[PDB]
Structures are given as C-alpha cells and as structure tokens.
Design a protein around this ligand. Structure first.
Ligand SMILES: O=C1N(Cc2ccc(CO)cc2)[C@H](Cc2ccccc2)[C@H](O)[C@@H](O)[C@@H](Cc2ccccc2)N1Cc1ccc(CO)cc1
Lengths: 99, 99
C-alpha cells in the first residue's frame, strides 16, 4: 500500500504466534521489538539510539509476517518503547521511500 | 526520487547557511539535528528515544532545504548522534512509503 506520513506508519505483524503493531522505520537499520516470548537461542547485543544504549537479545532467522508479507531475519528483543521494523526487513518486503 | 532501503536513506540539507547530511526517518515524528548555530531563540523540550531522553531546543519556523525542496517547520537541535528528518518535514516534501 502507499503510506503517507501524516500519521505514524503502523502495521500489524504476526511473530511467534502473537499479533503486534509495529512502526515502519526507515531510520532503524535493524528490527527491534519489545520484550516477548520467542523460543530458542539468542545473543546479547547492545544498540544505541537517541538517549543512549540498550541491551537487546539478538534472535536470528525469525519469521515475521508484516502486513500480508512474510519475511525471515534477525530480530532484537529488548526494552524499546515501540516496536520498530527497520531496514533489514523493509528491503525484503520491498518497501521504498518516495518523494 | 525513489529511494530503496538497502543503504541508509541520507539526503543533503541546507539549513541556516550550512550544508549537512540527514537521515530520512519515518519513525520520527519530528526533526532533530545535531548541535549547530542557529539564529533566534528557542524553547527547551525533552524527547525520548531508545536509551531514553534528551534535552533539546526547539526552534520553530525554520527553513530547511532538503534536496531541491524548501520547507519551514519546527526543528529540534540537540545531542543526537545523527541528524534526523522526521515526519513533520517529510509531510511537506511529499514523501510516501510504498510497499
Ligand atoms: O531512538 C531512535 N532511533 C534509535 C534506533 C537505533 C537503532 C535501531 C535498530 O537498528 C532502532 C532505533 C532511531 C533514530 C536514530 C538512529 C541511530 C542512532 C540514533 C538515533 C529511529 O530511526 C527513530 O525513529 C526513533 C525510534 C523511536 C521512536 C519512538 C520511541 C522510541 C524510539 N528513535 C528515537 C526518536 C524519537 C523522537 C524523534 C523526534 O521525533 C527522533 C528519534
């Protein structure tokens, strides 16, 4: 769909059986989700944002369905205030930015 | 321009006589720029991100030129590590997200 930016560009995702809303975020290189139940192995990573750094657990090869579209990739889970879909998955879904 | 997201979507901007590069960011409601010299005065605000909060100065009715396109809006100037163009100006240059 084409999304104007008058309102935050929020999408529904299903990950790990659960349904969330997430922000489409061209400024994030990676995806980061608030804290959740994901099975399996992960690694601690820390990421920096505005405001400072958080510690995050990195899960690889996670399937996400985002709007109708299905991607697989790394998701970082951690204390974010918002769920962010960043460019590692945006390029799989084929999102583009236009002006 | 149509911009795919395999690299960070950066553009050149001109603000207050100075040239800078900034990130086009759909996750960000507002524009926040690294510390620089701007005329006029300003109001102090606090914004929160990952990591937490920062203290910034709001300037309003600032002219920015972002690729060939001029826009006026509020700009937050503060200790961000990256210059960010958020939705308040992305709206004025007519940016859309498409997938
Ligand atoms: O911290 C933010 N990161 C940090 C970030 C870093 C890494 C990842 C995973 O790779 C995800 C997010 C981005 C901007 C940025 C990039 C790199 C370094 C520093 C900053 C993001 O792209 C922006 O959308 C919001 C995301 C956000 C939005 C709401 C609440 C929390 C987080 N922010 C914060 C932000 C908030 C308000 C404004 C002004 O309105 C601008 C930025």
């Amino acid at each position: 769909p084409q999304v104007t930016l008058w309102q935050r560009p929020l999408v529904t995702i299903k990950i790990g059986g659960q349904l969330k809303e997430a922000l489409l975020d061209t400024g994030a290189d990676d995806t980061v989700l608030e804290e959740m139940s994901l099975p399996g192995r992960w690694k601690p990573k820390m990421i920096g944002g505005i405001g400072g750094f958080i510690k995050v657990r990195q899960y690889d090869q996670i399937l996400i369905e985002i709007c109708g579209h299905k991607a697989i990739g790394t998701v970082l889970v951690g204390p974010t205030p918002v769920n962010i879909i960043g460019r590692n998955l945006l390029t799989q879904i084929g999102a583009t930015l236009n002006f």
